[PDB]
Write a protein that binds this ligand. Structure first.
Ligand SMILES: *[C@@H](CS(=O)(=O)Oc1ccc([N+](=O)[O-])cc1)[C@H](CCc1ccccc1)NC(=O)[C@H](Cc1ccccc1)NC(=O)OCc1ccccc1
Length: 215
């Protein structure tokens, strides 16, 4: 695979968002992945709705948690593969309470046909990402509250509890790393991003990787 890949360089990644006091990380991970995949399928980069999932995805638990894989399936099986634009269904769960699901007054910004679950291997995840784009991954974010910048060479890897988005990697640097987009505003980390060492399963990054497929 390529020595280094950064999808932000190809204009495939939207701006960093804010999940607020809502434990809706899984929704930001799933939607961030869809946004990138939609763009890569030959459509203009569009901001999609995390609120749609938090409010309408009943197979998940809104601000109490959820799984990216459940979200991908809900979109396909229950919402006719549609994903609304963020402008038509704005985020309103930052206070910690998700408003009821509304089935009208929204515009479809993208559609997906399914999803694939990637192998639990960093080299294999990197290979898929280099060709197919950003991947939704679950990580242990225990040591992330104190993160201020730089490449994290040591990360607590015990329990998956957070959903984020892998946008790239750099194998040519002193210590190879992954580039990850977080949803805790641009004030956190490196303008909303975090770099963790690659190759030693830092933060359990290879455990639950997946991506939506837009036919
Ligand atoms: C994401 C949470 S976060 O709070 O933004 O992340 C963050 C990480 C770590 C810390 N920390 O160590 O201090 C602080 C902040 C989200 C939180 C959900 C939540 C809300 C309130 C209380 C506890 C938890 N985490 C999830 O939604 C996980 C993400 C995940 C984990 C493993 C594999 C894939 C995705 N999911 C989760 O808890 O799902 C439970 C569930 C399963 C099935 C159906 C419904 C819910």
């Amino acid at each position: 695979a390529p020595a280094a890949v950064d999808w932000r360089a190809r204009g495939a990644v939207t701006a960093v968002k804010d999940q607020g006091q809502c434990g809706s990380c899984w929704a930001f991970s799933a939607i961030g992945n869809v946004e990138c995949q939609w763009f890569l399928a030959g459509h203009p980069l569009t901001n999609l709705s995390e609120q749609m999932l938090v409010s309408c995805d009943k197979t998940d638990s809104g601000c109490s948690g959820g799984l990216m894989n459940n979200a991908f399936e809900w979109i396909v099986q229950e919402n006719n593969g549609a994903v609304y634009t963020e402008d038509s269904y704005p985020y309103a769960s930052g206070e910690g309470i998700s408003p009821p699901c509304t089935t009208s007054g929204h515009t479809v910004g993208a559609t997906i046909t399914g999803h694939v679950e990637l192998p639990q291997d960093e080299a294999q995840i990197a290979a898929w990402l280099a060709v197919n784009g950003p991947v939704a991954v679950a990580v242990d974010a225990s040591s992330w509250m104190t993160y201020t910048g730089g490449v994290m060479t040591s990360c607590v890897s015990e329990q998956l509890d957070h959903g984020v988005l892998l946008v790239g990697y750099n194998d040519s640097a002193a210590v190879p790393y992954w580039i990850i987009k977080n949803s805790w505003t641009t004030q956190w980390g490196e303008e909303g991003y975090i770099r963790i060492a690659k190759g030693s399963n830092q933060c359990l990054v290879k455990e639950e990787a997946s991506s939506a497929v837009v036919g």
